[PDB]
Every structure is written in C-alpha cells, then in structure tokens.
Amino acid sequence: SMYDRHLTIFSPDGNLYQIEYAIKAVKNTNITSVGVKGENCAVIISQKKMATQYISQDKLLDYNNITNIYNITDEIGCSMVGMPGDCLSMVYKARSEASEFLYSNGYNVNAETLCRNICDKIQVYTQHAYMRLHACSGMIIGIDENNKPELFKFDPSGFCAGYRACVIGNKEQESISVLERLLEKRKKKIQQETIDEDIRNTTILAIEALQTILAFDLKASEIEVAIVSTKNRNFTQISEKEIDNYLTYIAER
Amino acid sequence: ARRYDSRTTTFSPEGRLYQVEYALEAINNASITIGLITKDGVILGADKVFISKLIDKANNYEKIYKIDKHIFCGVAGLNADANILINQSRLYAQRYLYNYNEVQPVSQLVVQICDIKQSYTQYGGLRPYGVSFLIGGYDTKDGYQLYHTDPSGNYSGWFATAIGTNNLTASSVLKQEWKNDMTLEEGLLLALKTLAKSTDTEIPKSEKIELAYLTNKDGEVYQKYLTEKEIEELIKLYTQKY
Amino acid sequence: TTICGLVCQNAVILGADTRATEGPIVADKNCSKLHYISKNIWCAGAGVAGDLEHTTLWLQHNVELHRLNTNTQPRVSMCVSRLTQELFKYQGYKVCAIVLGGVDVNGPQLYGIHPHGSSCLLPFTALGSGSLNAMAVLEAKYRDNMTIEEGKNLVCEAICAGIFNDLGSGGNVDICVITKDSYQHIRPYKEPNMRLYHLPHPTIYPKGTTPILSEKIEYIK
Amino acid sequence: GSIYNYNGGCVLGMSGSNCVAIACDLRLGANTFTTVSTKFSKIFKMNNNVYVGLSGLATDIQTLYEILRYRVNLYEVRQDAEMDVECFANMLSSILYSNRFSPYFVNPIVVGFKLKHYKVNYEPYLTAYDLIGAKCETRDFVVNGVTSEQLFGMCESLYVKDQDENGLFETISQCLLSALDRDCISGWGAEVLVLTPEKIIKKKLKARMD
Amino acid sequence: TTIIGIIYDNGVMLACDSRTSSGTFISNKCSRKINRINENLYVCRSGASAHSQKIIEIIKHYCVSMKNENRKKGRFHEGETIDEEIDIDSINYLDYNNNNDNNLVTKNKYFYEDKFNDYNPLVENVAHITKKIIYTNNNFLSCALIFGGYDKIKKQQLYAVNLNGSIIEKHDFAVSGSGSIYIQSYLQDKYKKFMTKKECFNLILNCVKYAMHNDNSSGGLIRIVNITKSFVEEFTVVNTQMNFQY
Amino acid sequence: SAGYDLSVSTFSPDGRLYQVEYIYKSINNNNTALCLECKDGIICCCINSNMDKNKMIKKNSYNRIYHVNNNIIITYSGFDGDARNIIDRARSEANTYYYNFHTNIPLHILVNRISLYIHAYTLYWHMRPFAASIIISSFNEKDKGDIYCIEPNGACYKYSGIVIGKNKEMFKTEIEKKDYKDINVRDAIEDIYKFILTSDDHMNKNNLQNLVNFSWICKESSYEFQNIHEEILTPALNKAVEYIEKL
Amino acid sequence: MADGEYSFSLTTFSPTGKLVQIEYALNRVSSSSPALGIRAKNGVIIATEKKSPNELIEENSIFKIQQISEHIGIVYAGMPGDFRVLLKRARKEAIRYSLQYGSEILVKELVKIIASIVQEFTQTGGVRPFGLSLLICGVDVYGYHLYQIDPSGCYFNWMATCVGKDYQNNMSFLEKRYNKDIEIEDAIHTAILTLKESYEGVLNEKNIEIGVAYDNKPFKILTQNEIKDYLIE
Numbered sequence A: 001s002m003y004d005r006h007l008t009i010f011s012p013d014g015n016l017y018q019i020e021y022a023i024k025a026v027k028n029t030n031i032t033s034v035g036v037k038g039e040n041c042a043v044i045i046s047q048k049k050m051a052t053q054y055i056s057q058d059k060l061l062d063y064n065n066i067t068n069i070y071n072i073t074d075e076i077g078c079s080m081v082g083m084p085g086d087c088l089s090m091v092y093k094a095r096s097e098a099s100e101f102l103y104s105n106g107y108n109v110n111a112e113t114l115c116r117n118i119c120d121k122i123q124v125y126t127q128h129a130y131m132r133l134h135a136c137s138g139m140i141i142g143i144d145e146n147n148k149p150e151l152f153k154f155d156p157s158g159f160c161a162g163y164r165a166c167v168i169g170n171k172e173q174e175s176i177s178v179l180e181r182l183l184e185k186r187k188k189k190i191q192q193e194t195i196d197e198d199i200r201n202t203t204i205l206a207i208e209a210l211q212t213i214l215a216f217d218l219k220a221s222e223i224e225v226a227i228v229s230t231k232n233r234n235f236t237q238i239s240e241k242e243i244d245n246y247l248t249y250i251a252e253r
Numbered sequence B: 001a002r003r004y005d006s007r008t009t010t011f012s013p014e015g016r017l018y019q020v021e022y023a024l025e026a027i028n029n030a031s032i033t034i035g036l037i038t039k040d041g042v043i044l045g046a047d048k049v050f051i052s053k054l055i056d057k058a059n060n061y062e063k064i065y066k067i068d069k070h071i072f073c074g075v076a077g078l079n080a081d082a083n084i085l086i087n088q089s090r091l092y093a094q095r096y097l098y099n100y101n102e103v104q105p106v107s108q109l110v111v112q113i114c115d116i117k118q119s120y121t122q123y124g125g126l127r128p129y130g131v132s133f134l135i136g137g138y139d140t141k142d143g144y145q146l147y148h149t150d151p152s153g154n155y156s157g158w159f160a161t162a163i164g165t166n167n168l169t170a171s172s173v174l175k176q177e178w179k180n181d182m183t184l185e186e187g188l189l190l191a192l193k194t195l196a197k198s199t200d201t202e203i204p205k206s207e208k209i210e211l212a213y214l215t216n217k218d219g220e221v222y223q224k225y226l227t228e229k230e231i232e233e234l235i236k237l238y239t240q241k242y
Numbered sequence C: 001t002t003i004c005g006l007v008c009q010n011a012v013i014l015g016a017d018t019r020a021t022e023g024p025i026v027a028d029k030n031c032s033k034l035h036y037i038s039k040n041i042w043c044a045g046a047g048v049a050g051d052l053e054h055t056t057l058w059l060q061h062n063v064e065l066h067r068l069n070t071n072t073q074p075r076v077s078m079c080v081s082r083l084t085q086e087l088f089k090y091q092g093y094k095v096c097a098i099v100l101g102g103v104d105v106n107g108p109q110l111y112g113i114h115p116h117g118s119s120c121l122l123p124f125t126a127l128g129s130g131s132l133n134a135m136a137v138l139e140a141k142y143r144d145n146m147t148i149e150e151g152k153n154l155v156c157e158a159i160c161a162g163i164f165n166d167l168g169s170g171g172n173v174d175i176c177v178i179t180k181d182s183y184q185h186i187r188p189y190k191e192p193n194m195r196l197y198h199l200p201h202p203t204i205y206p207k208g209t210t211p212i213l214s215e216k217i218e219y220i221k
Numbered sequence D: 001g002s003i004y005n006y007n008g009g010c011v012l013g014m015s016g017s018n019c020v021a022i023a024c025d026l027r028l029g030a031n032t033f034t035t036v037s038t039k040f041s042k043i044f045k046m047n048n049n050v051y052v053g054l055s056g057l058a059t060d061i062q063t064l065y066e067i068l069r070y071r072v073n074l075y076e077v078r079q080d081a082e083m084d085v086e087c088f089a090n091m092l093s094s095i096l097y098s099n100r101f102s103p104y105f106v107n108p109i110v111v112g113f114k115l116k117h118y119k120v121n122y123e124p125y126l127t128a129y130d131l132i133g134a135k136c137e138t139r140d141f142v143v144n145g146v147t148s149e150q151l152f153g154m155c156e157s158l159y160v161k162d163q164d165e166n167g168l169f170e171t172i173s174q175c176l177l178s179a180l181d182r183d184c185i186s187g188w189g190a191e192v193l194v195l196t197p198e199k200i201i202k203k204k205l206k207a208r209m210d
Numbered sequence E: 001t002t003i004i005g006i007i008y009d010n011g012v013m014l015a016c017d018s019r020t021s022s023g024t025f026i027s028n029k030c031s032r033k034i035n036r037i038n039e040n041l042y043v044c045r046s047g048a049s050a051h052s053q054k055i056i057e058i059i060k061h062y063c064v065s066m067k068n069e070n071r072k073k074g075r076f077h078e079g080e081t082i083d084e085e086i087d088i089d090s091i092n093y094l095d096y097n098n099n100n101d102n103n104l105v106t107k108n109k110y111f112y113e114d115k116f117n118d119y120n121p122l123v124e125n126v127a128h129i130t131k132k133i134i135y136t137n138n139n140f141l142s143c144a145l146i147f148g149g150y151d152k153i154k155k156q157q158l159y160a161v162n163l164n165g166s167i168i169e170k171h172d173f174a175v176s177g178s179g180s181i182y183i184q185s186y187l188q189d190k191y192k193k194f195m196t197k198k199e200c201f202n203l204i205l206n207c208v209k210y211a212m213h214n215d216n217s218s219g220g221l222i223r224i225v226n227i228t229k230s231f232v233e234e235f236t237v238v239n240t241q242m243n244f245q246y
Numbered sequence F: 001s002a003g004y005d006l007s008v009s010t011f012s013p014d015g016r017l018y019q020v021e022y023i024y025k026s027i028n029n030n031n032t033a034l035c036l037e038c039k040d041g042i043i044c045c046c047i048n049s050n051m052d053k054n055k056m057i058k059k060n061s062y063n064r065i066y067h068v069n070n071n072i073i074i075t076y077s078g079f080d081g082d083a084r085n086i087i088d089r090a091r092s093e094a095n096t097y098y099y100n101f102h103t104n105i106p107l108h109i110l111v112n113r114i115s116l117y118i119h120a121y122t123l124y125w126h127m128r129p130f131a132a133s134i135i136i137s138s139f140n141e142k143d144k145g146d147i148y149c150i151e152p153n154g155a156c157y158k159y160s161g162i163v164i165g166k167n168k169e170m171f172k173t174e175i176e177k178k179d180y181k182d183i184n185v186r187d188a189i190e191d192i193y194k195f196i197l198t199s200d201d202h203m204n205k206n207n208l209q210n211l212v213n214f215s216w217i218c219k220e221s222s223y224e225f226q227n228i229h230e231e232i233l234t235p236a237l238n239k240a241v242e243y244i245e246k247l
Numbered sequence G: 001m002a003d004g005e006y007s008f009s010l011t012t013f014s015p016t017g018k019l020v021q022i023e024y025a026l027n028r029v030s031s032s033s034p035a036l037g038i039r040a041k042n043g044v045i046i047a048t049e050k051k052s053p054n055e056l057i058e059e060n061s062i063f064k065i066q067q068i069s070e071h072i073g074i075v076y077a078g079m080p081g082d083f084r085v086l087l088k089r090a091r092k093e094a095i096r097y098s099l100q101y102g103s104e105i106l107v108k109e110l111v112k113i114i115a116s117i118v119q120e121f122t123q124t125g126g127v128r129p130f131g132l133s134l135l136i137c138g139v140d141v142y143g144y145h146l147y148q149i150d151p152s153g154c155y156f157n158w159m160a161t162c163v164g165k166d167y168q169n170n171m172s173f174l175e176k177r178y179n180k181d182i183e184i185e186d187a188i189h190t191a192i193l194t195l196k197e198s199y200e201g202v203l204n205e206k207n208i209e210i211g212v213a214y215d216n217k218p219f220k221i222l223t224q225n226e227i228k229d230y231l232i233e
C-alpha cells in the first residue's frame, strides 16, 4: 500500500523501511563510539559531543555533562549512540532490566544476556505498528562469570552480537578495516602481557582507533574513555589527565 | 492512525462485505474438496497440492481432520486459519461433552464454529477467516450429516457437494452420479471419479488423493483415513469399473 | 522424613529416607525425596508431598529455561532466590522444607530452606521429622574437608539415625553426590529395612474360589 | 475427614504378569450410613491402556472424571495417538495440585499399561494419589479410599508377585472382599476389571450386601 | 537475637549474635544477621527470619536502582586527592583451642570503590524506603532492623526501624532483639561520646557477650562490622564465654 | 514532508522526525525565557512580549516561572497547558521521591525523569507530543548553579546560561559577552533589562514593568525560590532604560 | 495503540484472495541465508550458512541453530529478532508441556503450538507477520521429525528441505541425492554439499552451523572441529 514505508510492515521486496530509517537517524547524529576487547579487559571510547540535532552547541553549554557512556550497573556500562531521548530511554530500560534480573535470580546479569534482553524489547517495536522505533545503537561491555571481557553491540533492528572490536558511527566499513589492522598488529606479538600492560595496550588501541577513524587529533577534553578489567571489574571512566597521557604517548611513537 | 484502517467489517455500497468476497475468492482458488453421504457413512475426499517429492507422505493428512470421534472435516482455503478453527471446534465438541455428558450433535458444532466466523465478520476490525469447511459426522438425532461452511459464517446441509477450485465440474458429476442409497464402495468409487474429473484427468493418482470416511458400525462411530495403498486398490477398482 | 546434606571436598552430598506416610500408615515405602534441579543442582524435600513434588518440578523447569536462554551454568543462588520468593509468597502454606545443594562458579554450596521462605548457607544440615537425630549424628561427626567416601558414610549414618529413631522415617537410604562435572544418584544406597518373617508358602487361592454374579469378556483391537 | 465418610467407597489396583487389575466397591452412601445406590462404579476408562479409580466425594468423583475425560480427549485428538499412561498420571497430579488450597476430595488410583515400543511390550503401571496430587508409583498394588488400612493389610499379606490372570483375579477379589467386610460404609457389591494387552474381563462379585 | 549499633568517633560498629531458633531448638547455629546493602551500608536483622531476609533482598534491589540513578554524567575530582587495628587473634585466643583448627579466617577488610561518595545512596534514604516497605505491610510483617552506614552528608549514622514500621535515628547507640533488654543499662552506663575504635569494639563485644549469657534466644558466635569513611572491617569472635570471679 | 510528517511515530526516509521539528518551530516562535548563573545565585527571566497588545490583562498576572520544592526553578517556552502538565509531573515526582526516601529529589534525577516523561509522548501514533521546552535549575552554596534545559524530543543538556523561545540568538549573543559567574545576581538584573530592551523589538521602557517575570534563587533569599521584589527591579529598570536612551 | 480503535488488521485480503503481507514476508525469507534439514534413517540434521560479515564479529555470539529442549533443535531463515522471540516462546511452551505431562514435548505438538502463534500475527490487529521460516527437527517416541513453519503459520512435514536464498535450486540438488535410508554421516555430507553448491566461493568450519539428533540421543550442535573433520574429505 501507499503506507508501507510509514509503519513496520513489509514492503513488496520484504524490507521494513522504518528500521532502515531509524538506523539512518542513528547515523545522522555524527557520533562515533569504539569498543575494543583485551585478554582481561574491555574499553569503550566515545566523543564527548552533542548529537547533531535541531538545536546547536552553545558556548554556555556545560561540556563536562555531555556524554554517551553510562553505567548500567556497577560492573556493566555501555555507549548509547543516537537520538538523546531514545538513548536515555534505552539506558533506563537496560538499568531496570538489570535490576529485575538481579532481584529475580540473586546474581548480576552479564553483558551478553542484558544485550539479548534489550534486543528482545526492541523487537516488539519492530513488530507493533503503533510504537515508534528507538533510534539508538549501543555497545555494552562487562566481565563475565569466567573473568573474560564481553563486547556486545545492538542496533535499532534488534540485532545484537559479540565483537572483538566494534564501531558505532557514520562510517563502519572503513572503521572495520582500521580495527582489523590494529587487532592483527596487536595479535602478531608473542610476548605475554601483564594485567596492567594488557589494559594499557587495550586503551591505547581504542584511542588510536578512534583517532584513525575520525581523522583528526583527539583532544583529551572532547573524548571519554571507560574500562572494565579483571583488576577492576567496575565500569569506570578514566580521568582527562590519563587520556591526555595516552594521547601524548600515541603522538610520540 | 485511522488512515491505516482498512475497515474490514464495513458494508459496501451494495450491501456487500468485500473482505468476505475476497476470502471466498481465495477459497475458490484452493484445491478441490468433496464430500458425499452413502448409507454406510460420510465420505470426504480431497486433492493434495504438490510441493515436492520430499514431503513426508506417511500418516500426513493435511486437508481432512478429525474433530471428534463422530465428526471430521475437510478444508478448503488458508490452512493456518483452518488449523485455528479446527482447534476451536475440537474444543467445542469436548466442551459439549463436559457440560452434557453426551457427544455433541453435528449441527450444533457447525453452528458454533460458524458463529466464530460470523463474529469476525461483524465485530472488531480484523480480517475474516479464509476457510471453507466440509463437516461430516454421525449422531443419533440426525443420522449421517454433511455441512458446508463459508467465511461469512454461513452453512447449509448437503447430500453431496464440493468446495475449492473447479467445484462446478465435481458438483455436476455428483449431481449426475450420486444416488440416494449407495454403499461405501460405490461412494468411494464415485468420490474418486469426481476427484479425477475435477483435476482434469481420467485415471486419478494416489499421490495426490486424500480419502477418508466415517461409519457408524455395530454402535461405534469409526473413522478410516485411507492410506496410499488402500487408495491404490480403489484406483485399480475404478479403472476396472471405467 | 529425614533429609540431610553436607559439604565435602569439591562436592555436595545429599541423603534421604524413602517413607511417605498418610497419618499413622505408611503410604509409600520407597518414595524418592532427592530431586534433580540441574546437572549441578539437586535438592532434598521434606513436608507436604504434593507441594514438594510440584515446587521442585517448577524449579527444575524454570532453571532449564534460564540455562537455555543464558547459556551459562545454573547457580545455586538463583534456586535459593526463586524458591524462597515463592515460599514467602505462600506464607508457609506451601509446606516445603528443602535442603538445596550444588556446585557452581562459587564452589560447592548447601542451603537449608524453610517453608516460610528463609534460607541459610551451611556446611551441613538435616530437615524433617528425623532431623534432630540426623543432626545429632552430624554434629557429633562432621568435619571440614572430608573426602567423598567419608561424606557418603556420614550422610548414610545420619539418615540411618533418622530412620531408626523417628517413626515418620524409614525405608532405604538414597544419596546423591554433586560435583562440578556431574552428579551420582544412588538409589538405594543402604537398604537397611526388609521384611523379616515370610510364610513358608505363599497363599495361592484355587481357581474359582471367589463367587461371581456376572462376567463379560471384551477383546481389544 | 468426615467428608470422605459421607459417601464411603474404595479402589484397589494390582498387577500380575502381562496383566493388571483394578477393583472397586459399588456403594453410593449418603450421610455416612444410608445406602442410596449399589451400581456406582468408581472405575473409569480413559483409553484402552489407562484406567482411573476415583474414590471419595461422589460429586468430586464425577467432576474430576469429566475434567480428565475432557483433557484426555483433547490431547488424543490433537496428537492422533493414545495418551501414554505416565503422561496421564503426571497430568492428573497437575490437575489435583492446581486446586491445592480448595481441592477435590478424591483419592484416585491409576492402573494401566506402559507401552515400550520396540513389536510392543506391555508393562503394568500403578499409581496412587492423595487429593493434592502427590504420587506413589508401585509395582505390586495400590489402594485408596476409606477402606485403605484394611486393603493395605490384605495386600501386604496376600499379594503374590507375577501371577497370571486367574491368580490375579482371585487375589485382588479376595483382598477387596476381606477388606470390605470390615468397613461399615463400603461394599454393597464389587466390580473387578482384569486387563491384558488382548482383552478386558469385567466381573461383578457375589459380595455382602449389608 | 541480639543486634547492636554504636557510633564512635571515627565510625559506626554493628555487632550481632548468630543464633536462629524455632522454639527451644536451634535451627541455625551461626546465621548472618549483619548484611551488606551497599559497600558502606549494612543492616542488622531482628525478628522472623523469612520476613527480614525477604525485606533485605528487596531493599538491596532498591539500593542498586538508587545507586545507578545517582550516577551523574561526566568526570569529577580531576585533582581531589582522597587507626590502631583490633588484636582480634588475641580476643579469639583460648588455651584449649590453640592450632586445633589452624585454617580460620576471622577478619576481612575492604576499601570503598566510591571514594568520594559520589553515588552511594544516603543511609537515611535506604532506611526510609525500608521503613516504607515495612509500614505498608505492617499487618503481616514482624521484623526490627538497625541500619548503620557512612555518607558524606551526615557521616556515620544509626537508624532503628522498629516493629510496625516506625523509624528513629540514633546518634549514640541502638539495640534490638530479645537479648538487648538485658544489656540495656550496662550499655547506657558504659557508653560515652567520641569513643575510640578500641573502646567501641570492646564495649560492643562485651554487650553481645552479656546478652548471650542471659538470653537463651541469643548465642552462637559474634559478628562485628566496623564502618568508616574509607573502609569496612568485619570480625568474627568465637571466644564468647563469660567468666565471673564470684 | 512527502507524507512522512503526519505522525510522530514515522521516521522520514532521511532519518528525521518532522513532527518534532514542527514543535521546535512552535517553541521558537513563542515567548522568551532565560536562566543565568551568577556568582551568588541563579536568575530567571521570562519576557511575555507576545502579550503586548493585551492591554486589559491584569498587571503582572501571567507568570511562567514556577518552583518544585521551594528550591528548584522551572520555567518554559511553549504551550501553557503542556507546560503545566509537565510541571505537575515534576512536582508529582518530587512528592514520590520524598515519600520513598525522605530527602528532596536531586536536580539531575528529576531532570532525567521529566525528560523521560516528555520523550514518552513522542513514541505512539495516537498521542500529541508536548510543545514546550523546559528550563529546570537550582543553586546552593556548595554546588553553585545547575541549569538544565529539556527539549521536546526529550534531550536534556546542562548549561551555564540558557535562552529558549523567540529572539534567543540575540539574547545569547548579549549573554555570552560577560562571564556572569563573577557577577552578582543584583548586578545581572540591569544587564538583563538592557538585553530585553535591545533584543525584543516588541518591548519598550513602557511595558518592561508588566511584561517581564523575574525570579531567583540566591544567597539573599537563603537559596530558596523568590520572585524579585519590585523595589529591586525598579532601579535596575530605570538605569537600563536611561543608559539605552543615551545611545 | 495496542487497544481501542487502533487495533485493526494490517494483513487483509486482496481482490484475488491473496494476503500480500504474507507474500512479502515470504520474499524476505527467500532473501535470507540458506538453511536446510535432512531426515536420515536414525537421526535428523539441520544445517545453516553462517557467513561472518567481518573478522571482528564473534561467531559463537551468533548461533542460528538453537536447542528448544533435549532432542529438539531449531534453525531459521529470515529476521533474527523475530527468531529470538519465537525461540523464547518455543522454550516456554516446551516447559509448559513438560510441567503438565512430566515428559518431553512431542515434536508435532510443539510445531502446532508455534504455528498457531505465528498465525495469530497474520490476523490480530496492529502487527505485521513474522518475517522468517523455521525448521524444527526432533526425536520422540514416534520417530524422527523435520517440520517447516512458514510466515503464514502453515506447517509442512519434510524428509528434507531448504529455506532461504535460492532454495529451489538447493531443493533440486537435495532431491537428486536424498534417499530415506541414508545414515547420519551421509546426511551431514549431503547437507554440506548442498550448502557448498549454494554458497558462492569456498565454505569452511566458520561459515556453517550444524545440529544433529540421532540414535535416540540429545540434540547436539556440531563444534568447529567436528565440522572440520566432515569437511576434510
């Protein structure tokens, strides 16, 4: 019919164009996030940038409040890219899902299951016509019950998967090429790492990847970096000073 | 959101219900289903739609279904809608048995399922069921019975009838050949004849035929779903007799 | 009833008698009181028989559902949370006193769950009408870091104390050993009770001794 | 307690070799001492391999039998096969428990054959229930009803393993009759059904009528 | 059951016996009546075991929700830079038990992850949501709780949630359970403001010991939790017997 | 457009939600509201210049500045009814927070809850989205000022000074010249009157008194909500007016 | 929304009698990565193509072959979120049956229940049909079964079948070399060969998932190494 691109119903070729348009809406925000997995840790790096939306960035804006990284629980955090209302909504949905899991089962949900439950929530928006799609794509990290890091990514279509490294942003084929090169370069070394060495290398890889993707010099004040490891399983950001030190090391090499 | 409503349960300028007409077109586009009453029981026959030689053709009847011990139906139309309504009618028969401690008369069961269909045509904003039923059975009140239902919730009793594609040819064959006191064998041979002539051929093929009948013998009502072997035997008898 | 469990080296061991009573009458002489929740989680049940059967079945099936949906090894803590919440919801009217044991990422664990919904993590415990006798034996003889054979012997001795000192207990001794990699359900493990006296010949009534009024034969298929 | 004395009645199941038997008294009591019927069977055929004996409150007996017949008929029409006796036993347990707090005042037994399809082997199957669905799987005998203690004594004393159909009939009939003769509120006839994979034999015993 | 809380100069100490009984029978010899709600927030349980356990589980869930909602967006503290240990082994030494069980962990200490108290729920908030839960169902629920914790606003605090769902804040000490009635005046006479860690520990231990001596419903062992601004310390005392010269 | 702008629950093929943009246009056409952080407080001002031709309105009767717990300022630009709805929800959330926890709802949690409430009206095909943007702000000695602005799309951002509604760009240009974190609220009053005289061409020195709402939370008011007294607004108005008429 | 006047069918009849939304869901399936199942003498195999978009993705994180219960497995061709929802529902129905009757759910009963659930979404108001097809394989007392479920809610009983991309050509390839008296190893080889003939390029242990149920054993998803051995020849 004339409205097959208005609702979540199949078009003649089998597509649900509303899902495609929600994904494009995510892409329109011009926000880039990168998650990278180590051997005993995981990192997420995002721009501390307001999503390109109707309103613009004022010089009286408090730039410290601008963020795309959230804690879901003490041990699980995420990056939510897309429409800020939808991103906040998904953050709250994920927090409530994690809390309900904990109460029902007496132990904390791991990142994989939380991602899958979130995507089961999103599928309902994809099938019921009266609800708008949440223009939001996310990355979720945590340390699973075997002390292994997890990196999972969901998008508006309700599809999720685990990754060695991932990028949400405008470009993702070339981001994938950059990340694959960085990962193989890191993997070709045979010397064993310490926990601290592994965390340092993972964070440097995340920063250098975001930089090689965005194609300009990252300033420590305009990006955010969050980590989870077996040394510190809490999902914690790192200071602007440590980000700056990582950047000075990256530049001088 | 009203702009997306297709208004299924709304009269047309000629007092017609378009969704029901289209459901009837779909039923008319389904494979032939026939039924006829002998003095030995009700016969239901159907042509199977070919999909692949890899379908499992053992104990897999997809157009004739048991509703109760004394009731069984043939389907013409959308098979999933039919599955829904068949589940409902099995429930209805068992509910009647629970409430009254006796098996449900056939006409009451047909009325209940047809009420479901009519309700979908009158209330709500959903599309109707795209299925026609040939319901046959036995009960002490009315003996052997055979009924035909359509998406509008209509029904009517028949001594012989056909639904689905090319029902005109099969109905004419039945009108010419059906008699008031036939034996089970004669009924089965006539069912094979009308199935063969509606499918545009002369000798029918066992692979494409579903045949079942329902007899009240010695006081027990018993349903027989003929296998490919029994149908092959009957096909040989038919090719002898014609 | 006498059920008991203890923790030993990298294993949990459960034990139970097999009597079910309907008043002062023994209704079932060989009822099973050890219930499979998952490959690494078992439980023993005392209280109302129907409540135990249906609560443990519900728990087992929900645990399997959870395992399938998460693809992770079931946790004993999850069983504790689910069971205690259910029992609390029924304010003790679901009479289920359960010894729950299993092995997971947090090692071997054992819980004593009570019908009102309380739980307690313990190295050993006993529940049921015979729990006082079994607890006497366990308190006398329990030790940390017992071997599995020693734990099996102690569990059997405790269940036997319950069997021989409590009228509500009896029958055989059933045991399950739950480790990280598998379980071992032994049923029966002890068989300490059998019929002593038998008549020298079993009474066989001659054919036709019972008078009948009518008879009808009805063949099948 | 006294609710079960209102009507009276009892049921008994026993197995032999490739045979199984189910028996019941035929009385319908009222007010614990008035006999109003002498043809009130407690035995019900679910399918050819599954029988249920329902003792207790007659209204609940009839109601539960109707529920079970509804469920079995739906299951078997949907599946296009006879319900296995163990599935039926578990289903009966679940139905009884679903009324855990306002239960049906019934004391069921299930008797039948567990089919082990290779040829087919017919293994006798016996189960006794309480009113909230607790189950007792057994190989020799099952009892239920207000006459339970007498039936338990008779069975413990007289049951003989691996009896043929005639020996099974004599044993179960003697157990039932002796037990009934000591009960004020049960008796007034006995029906005995002896099951084999090939045939069912239904007998009415010349029993006491006081 | 005996549960006690005492505020001292640098923290708040929570102590408890460990006996759970059903009548005269001791169903659990060593229960755990002092439960962590948050890294710096503990509750001492009294009353019916099922009631207090299920209440505390609900409250832990609520506390996780509150804590994660308290998290502000951004980075903070880009510069902000953030006592005599109890001789527990000597408290727990007994002549007739010396190396009889060498492997015995009687102490534990951990540091707060939320160093600046940026997101940890206020003690008062958690205590009040608990009071709300108990009061809404005070026709059925019978359990008395003591909350102890440290937050950056009011520092170390004690809140008594009494039976029927009332809440009172205590600034010196709080006592609950059938055993505390016996040590009421002992504690009143021996308590002083701004006690040291050592004085508070000795006092709370002696209070529990006297209560266990006098109350049959109390017994087992003694669990003591000490909550400071930076760390939490937990001790187990197994030397509970009381020796009278007379 | 192209048929994709009739519902708030249909994304356009370029990924945009047009009903939300139309609401933004409505808000930008509506009256002006601003909040400004100063050294010892925050100052909020609403310019009701759309009502300049409404001569019979009771003097100073239309006020767009409300408060939540006597210590949080909440104002808006957009539909009055929708804003009242959102303010009722804000107060309801504050009541619920106090009931649950016995402490006042923190500003940032309240902002998140309000933004989620607003965002929920952009999700369904049968609900009109709110046509209003909200300013929510507080101030206390230790934390200084916190100013949040919530958009109709449900996005909340934090500012040191914010202007919504009509002529907001010129007001922002005037506001950004001086660092008000080192100026006192009283001194900021005259600056704000000057900005109003310049930016809003519908406002003159005759209707400045009856068309402007002023409130603050500052040290002078014990960090609790208060409408600025006319005995403070009068000298500032006169000074701004004479200074402007000079040039 | 989900109630009131706003609950009307989105799938309706066309003049010719067709329900075009079901046809469009079918097209969506026919554009998806191929899946197939084979019923052998003493087991049933379901196999699928799992082509990793990038070297970054974790293959184990995506399994197109899932277990519903012991002895029952499922694979799909089509939209993965729909599959997740239906798989959760199938597990729920399996345990509901297991709680009522104690034993494991019979494959036919599960298939009928799931087909009815699928059918509801072609008639109930305010929703689209599911955009996928399912293959359900299993073993019970009544033998080995391989069932397909279509977006419309119709179900078919198969000796062997393929869904998804160019499934007509795959079907011809599979029907050229299927007999009812094959063995488990021959069936696995045939499934792999069919997928090879469909897949464009070179297959490997990472491009395919396989699940088996044979010789009255619990359903099992072949690991990478087992598939590698099957691919050595």
Ligand SMILES: O=C(NC1CCCC1)[C@@H]1CCCCOc2cccc(c2)C[C@H](N2CCCC2=O)C(=O)N[C@@H](CCN2CCOCC2)C(=O)N1
Residues within 6 Å of the ligand: C001, C019, C020, C021, C022, C023, C027, C028, C031, C032, C033, C045, C046, C047, C048, C049, C050, C052, D128, D129, D130, D131, D132, D133, D134, D135, D136
């Ligand atoms: O041994 C038992 N538990 C162990 C055995 C295994 C698991 C642990 C208890 C021991 C005593 C508990 C009785 O408190 C009840 C409270 C409420 C309801 C009922 C009982 C129900 C019912 N009542 C109550 C009186 C009339 C009647 O019938 C009844 O007594 N059930 C008997 C088992 C019944 N039979 C089922 C099939 O055959 C085996 C036994 C029963 O639960 N016993």
